[PDB]
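Escalated from tier 1: chloride ion holo job.
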Amino acid sequence: SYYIAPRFLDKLAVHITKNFLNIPGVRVPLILGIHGRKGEGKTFQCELAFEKMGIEVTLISGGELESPDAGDPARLIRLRYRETAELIKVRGKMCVLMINDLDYTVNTQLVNATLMNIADNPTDVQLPGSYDSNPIRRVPIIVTGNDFSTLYAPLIRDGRMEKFYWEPNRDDKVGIVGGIFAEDGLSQREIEQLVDTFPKQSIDFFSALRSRIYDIQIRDFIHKVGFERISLRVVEFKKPDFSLAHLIESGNLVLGEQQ
Amino acid sequence: SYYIAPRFLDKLAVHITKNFLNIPGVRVPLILGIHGRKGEGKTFQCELAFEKMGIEVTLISGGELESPDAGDPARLIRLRYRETAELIKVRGKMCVLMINDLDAGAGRFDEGTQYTVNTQLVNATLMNIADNPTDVQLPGSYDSNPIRRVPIIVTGNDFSTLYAPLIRDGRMEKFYWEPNRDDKVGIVGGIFAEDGLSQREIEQLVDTFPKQSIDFFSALRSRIYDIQIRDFIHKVGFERISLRVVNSLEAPPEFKKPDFSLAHLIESGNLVLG
Amino acid sequence: SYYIAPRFLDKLAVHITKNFLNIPGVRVPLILGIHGRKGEGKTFQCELAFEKMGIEVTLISGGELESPDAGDPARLIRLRYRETAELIKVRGKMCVLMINDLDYTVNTQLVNATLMNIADNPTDVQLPGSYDSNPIRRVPIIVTGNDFSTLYAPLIRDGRMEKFYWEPNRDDKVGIVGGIFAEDGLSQREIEQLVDTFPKQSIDFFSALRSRIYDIQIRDFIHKVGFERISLRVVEFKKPDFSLAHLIESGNLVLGEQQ
Amino acid sequence: SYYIAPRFLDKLAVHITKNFLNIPGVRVPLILGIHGRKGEGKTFQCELAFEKMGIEVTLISGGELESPDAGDPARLIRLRYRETAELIKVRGKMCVLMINDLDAGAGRFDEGTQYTVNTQLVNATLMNIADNPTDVQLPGSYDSNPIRRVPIIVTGNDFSTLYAPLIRDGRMEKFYWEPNRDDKVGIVGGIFAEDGLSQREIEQLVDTFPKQSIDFFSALRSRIYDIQIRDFIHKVGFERISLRVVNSLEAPPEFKKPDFSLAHLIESGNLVLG
Amino acid sequence: SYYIAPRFLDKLAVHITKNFLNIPGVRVPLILGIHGRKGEGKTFQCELAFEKMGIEVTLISGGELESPDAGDPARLIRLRYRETAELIKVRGKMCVLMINDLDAGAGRFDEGTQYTVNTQLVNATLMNIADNPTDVQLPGSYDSNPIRRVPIIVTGNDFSTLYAPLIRDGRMEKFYWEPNRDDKVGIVGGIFAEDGLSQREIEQLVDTFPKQSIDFFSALRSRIYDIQIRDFIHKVGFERISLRVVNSLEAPPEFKKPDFSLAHLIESGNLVLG
Amino acid sequence: SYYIAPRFLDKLAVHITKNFLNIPGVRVPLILGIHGRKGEGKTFQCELAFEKMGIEVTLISGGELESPDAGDPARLIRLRYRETAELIKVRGKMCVLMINDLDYTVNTQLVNATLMNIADNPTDVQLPGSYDSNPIRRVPIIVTGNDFSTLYAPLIRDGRMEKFYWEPNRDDKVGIVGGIFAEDGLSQREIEQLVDTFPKQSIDFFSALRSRIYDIQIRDFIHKVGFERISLRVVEFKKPDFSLAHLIESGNLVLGEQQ
Ligand SMILES: Nc1ncnc2c1ncn2[C@@H]1O[C@H](COP(=O)(O)OP(=O)(O)O)[C@@H](O)[C@H]1O
Ligand SMILES: Nc1ncnc2c1ncn2[C@@H]1O[C@H](COP(=O)(O)OP(=O)(O)O)[C@@H](O)[C@H]1O
Ligand SMILES: Nc1ncnc2c1ncn2[C@@H]1O[C@H](COP(=O)(O)OP(=O)(O)O)[C@@H](O)[C@H]1O
Ligand SMILES: [Cl-]
Ligand SMILES: [Cl-]
Ligand SMILES: [Cl-]
Ligand SMILES: [Gd]
Ligand SMILES: [Gd]
Ligand SMILES: [Gd]
Ligand SMILES: [Gd]
Ligand SMILES: [Gd]
Ligand SMILES: [Gd]
Ligand SMILES: [Gd]
Ligand SMILES: [Gd]
Ligand SMILES: [Gd]
Ligand SMILES: [Gd]
Ligand SMILES: [Gd]
Ligand SMILES: [Gd]
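Tier 2 regenerated the structure:
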């Protein structure tokens, strides 16, 4: 069972809900910009939160915009925005547009430009070349990335975008790591020790570490049979060690040879 | 609450009124071009001024003129000019044509797409209307009767050098909107008019963030309900928050206005900028 | 009655006339580049001079070139040049091409490039892609702008462009301001005092000041009736103050809240 | 001679073997994306690994996917996936689909031409295959039987941000290849394994050029035959050298392996870099 | 007045004469490419040289080759080559084909338009003519008789790297024209030959503006008539100046040559540069 | 009879031959980059070497690539490469692709990019948009230029390109200059003196000097007849001086007025 950090869940839930309330005399930022080191569960925890709140999400990947092969990223964002706006009026539920891994320089400008224009009038979002007298719904936008260009400063400053820095703290790690290894028969104190052993590491390192433990088996199994005859043999059965000792050496081999 | 900057109201009231008078000895510009930065309450101050003088507004949005689906923008501007003309005659009141965001996807708002406002055709159209505000006809039409002069308000971030001939001839007047300290104290004071702040604290707040737009200050007042909102979410529970806010069955949540200080606003402000 | 500054009228008249004389052993600059602070009557005084000399002018606006919406500025200049060249042969009169407010960086280069090429051979000016064995007439070109790019240095240097700096002096102001207020029943000494009161200001400030005096009336008239009922009232009759006292306070309100 | 870096061999052997096992409790990524710089023996270490495990490889080259003449690249990748599937079934051995140079003409290898790998369609295809590796059909075909899961190896210099969803879902695993000091000592040692060099001299050679790719080191060993070659040209004579080397009548020239020292390699290296 | 720089005249006279001689032991280049900066009297020194040797010139302008309306430029160059050939035969005198401004809208003279000189087709054509100057036929024509070799002079600011093969084969010779101090003293001296200046003052004038083109110096002499001109305008009156200068009824105004000094020229020069 | 410098002939011959040998365990650079001051016989000596070894050469000029008028330089290189690859399989002889005068910035990148890609796989060189399962032959590429962009550093470094600096030394000059004047009845000691008199000069200066001697005649002949009547006269017969004294003054006039 995966673990969503309470203050992460709050920030995101408050942002979305605040966009669907129409408290007069209170302008609301349309965009939530979640930034921080890569692989700290920005995307994963958003998805946890949405599943929990029963929110349907329209998802664009950052690579879908940074690439020359995708043509027009302004169009794509505006298409998905208007699409999510209709799903609100239809399903009568909270819906969200999400852009992932927003961290090229040329498409980056167009993307910033597009989000600025949408945030300026979340209700009058037209496809380029098109015009529709119809107001459409305001759709809260969640964005993730390593940091946000100084080109986003004007948005944050005028309260059209809310920045949120995500750096898991140790209670947050114990919870998330605890969930990563929740099916591996571990006690909290083993979980607390694991986190304290690798304390500058990203959440990603820890889920990588879990997969590595399975890889180490398969490696040894291959060394035993020999490479010469591994193919015939297969064309690795047991529950691996997972003891806290083994997770640590496995982690140290990862950190001694990483990236 | 909302504060109308006297000089914004004067400029716009004088421009419109002057267009309904036939004072000799001076040329009256038909067009008032209001330019300046975003988040300073331009279109909004216009709205407060119109709502106040009881002025009825025909609108053209910049995303309208940016579109083929508005057809010929020359034809559209003329249409709405004529449509707007019939109402001074019919309703017997001051009416205004207003064109908003006359430079939609330009500069830092450029999305790098095939479509942009044909601004030269727009300029050309306004020039033609302005030379003879009393005979504005659709292209290809010739035998219609004279009509009433309609003052035109255009907003944008800046106006192209193309508008220079209009200005040079006194057919258009640029009005730059950058709120000054006195303006900000007024507007910001109105934003925090129910929060039990002294005049001096409002002056302090403005002086603490001398480079910020008006929108920075109202954005600032907005983030403090967040706690009530979060708590409201916890009470209803995450499993059922969606149903609660969007299905309009039971009543909207009733939020109290919170208490805060100058100190807290300044702190919040620095966090936003840091 | 508007006032043209004698040395402005001379410079321009000498340039044009010099281009229509064919004094052998004397090469003549084709381009007159008039530069200076904005709103000092560069354009207005050119127009005064042309009206006076009975010169027909072909006018291009700088914004007509700086804009992406106008396509090809080289073409446009060359079209208008050849057009003015024909009007000489037809009307048998002095004709002039004028480019206004030349102060983007990309079109600016093409414009400079176009004027260089034309100035190099004022008689062989072909539309791009076209060729015509026919010589056409030499057409003097007047250009205005705040300053001229270092890209114009080669032209000025080889005597294909004459630079002329325009900064009205006080005799020039008294004359021009005197004409701006010529119908407002003012004595020279009131005109001389007005100019001396606002002495770093552009001519533009002064014609703005005159219009402001009318605006102040209409303002007060609106304050009296009230905004609530101004619309019905109209759907401001008298000759405004214009006393030298009133022009001064009006000017000081303009300079205390300008741009 | 050739040295297989243990950890390269382990990563690739584990990835492939893991794809032929049905171990529960963990998701097995179908795709192994091997990225890193050029001239570090990537595709080559893969070849040594495949030749070793007796693994048969179906290939797609990046210049294949860059071409209309490969038709639809989605259709091609699927074809070769299915073609590669039939062989695990038929030959009863481990088989791999491998896509090489997945970013052919991008970055410093850009030739500025109309054609580039439609990498989004490629990504989309791999995503679809990966969700269901057991039912991979050509577009427009529906009623074929299940097939065998095929591990996929892709090489490139870097992988687009588009592959992030594949990785995030554990359908793909990135493996960065930058040879470390221990790797280089191994590989370089194998390059100079017949040249009578001590372990220490090999360590010295590596440490003298710590920033160089593997290809720099073998390039270095190659230029020393040049003298034998020149002399061979002088003997045959320039008039007849062409006939001699290309017409395969008489036998290929037989060159001796020369003697050289660490000192000479280092000198040669500095000349190449200077 | 006009001064012909001896070495310009020698280079061009030798190039042309050499092309009408059949001296063995050396290859004669058909083409003389004269390059260098604008405003240095290139085309003009050519004109003085041709007028002097009694050489008749067939011309192609760069704006001709830039145009579809010249049709195929390969066909045109060949036409004029043949046209120019018939005259050495008919008139019995030296004749030259001259191509001017061979790089019309390139570099700082680029107008950013669809049309530019197809310079590769031009180069290709000159290459072909040069290999066989005696059989130059229009494309698609085959059975014409031999003709006379025509020396070709081309001017431009620089010559593309494409002309390298022509030069390498001695079919073309580049001649760079940058006036040196001795040249300038000559040319400038000729510009001011009627102004009662000593040799030393001319040397001083040249040395005061060592970086300026020849055109800077004649531009300088030109602006001093301005006063006579202004006064002439005042006499006739602004109302009637247009009629006077352009209608060729009464006679052209007769201007006197004014008196001026080195001091005044230098001052004027600094004002122009400042 | 023209003279090829022995070490120039060696370097080039060794490079080409080395590309046609398939000595296992020896990777061979495909590209030979010959760089140095302009006009030192880089191109000319390549051509001498090819004529000597009976090598047919496919030649591209650098200007054929640097120009906007030639469209696609990647294509052009790849076309010529595949063409030379076929001539090997057909003629059964050594063939070479040569690129001359490679010393705009935009095409320069594409050219570098193209040579990198070809050098990476000399056997799988496809036209853009095309694919052919067929291996084609490895074609050694010779390139000349004044220097090679830092963009070529990766190639040289990974042994896909061999750099070769060409600066003629005095034995090299005596040989080459000796051949330039081989038909002018000169002794070596006159040749040695000529080279020592103009010792910082390029080989180009010397072949220019030879042509100048003929030009000086024709000049004097023109001065005698007079320019006024040179045309009629012609519409310069003798073997010119060529004495070592005359070559020297002719050289000094060239160096006193050059470029
Ligand atoms: N709350 C979580 N529970 C379990 N695993 C997680 C959690 N957050 C992150 N992970 C693991 O770490 C990886 C990286 O998370 P991701 O959302 O991609 O980080 P970011 O969005 O900050 O780059 C995921 O692929 C997942 O396996
Ligand atoms: N000679 C003049 N007489 C009367 N008004 C003038 C005169 N010159 C300028 N003005 C006023 O000042 C304004 C600015 O002049 P303009 O020619 O636009 O200046 P510039 O060309 O230097 O920018 C004009 O719109 C006009 O109202
Ligand atoms: N080996 C040689 N023999 C005779 N002449 C030569 C020789 N090398 C160069 N030249 C002369 O010098 C000129 C310049 O040589 P080139 O090959 O163009 O130099 P680079 O290729 O270095 O620019 C040639 O046009 C030729 O006349
Ligand atoms: Cl601030
Ligand atoms: Cl190194
Ligand atoms: Cl100078
Ligand atoms: Gd990540
Ligand atoms: Gd109508
Ligand atoms: Gd105060
Ligand atoms: Gd401000
Ligand atoms: Gd102005
Ligand atoms: Gd199949
Ligand atoms: Gd060691
Ligand atoms: Gd390295
Ligand atoms: Gd003919
Ligand atoms: Gd002297
Ligand atoms: Gd000079
Ligand atoms: Gd050369």
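Chain F has two domains: 1-168, 169-259.
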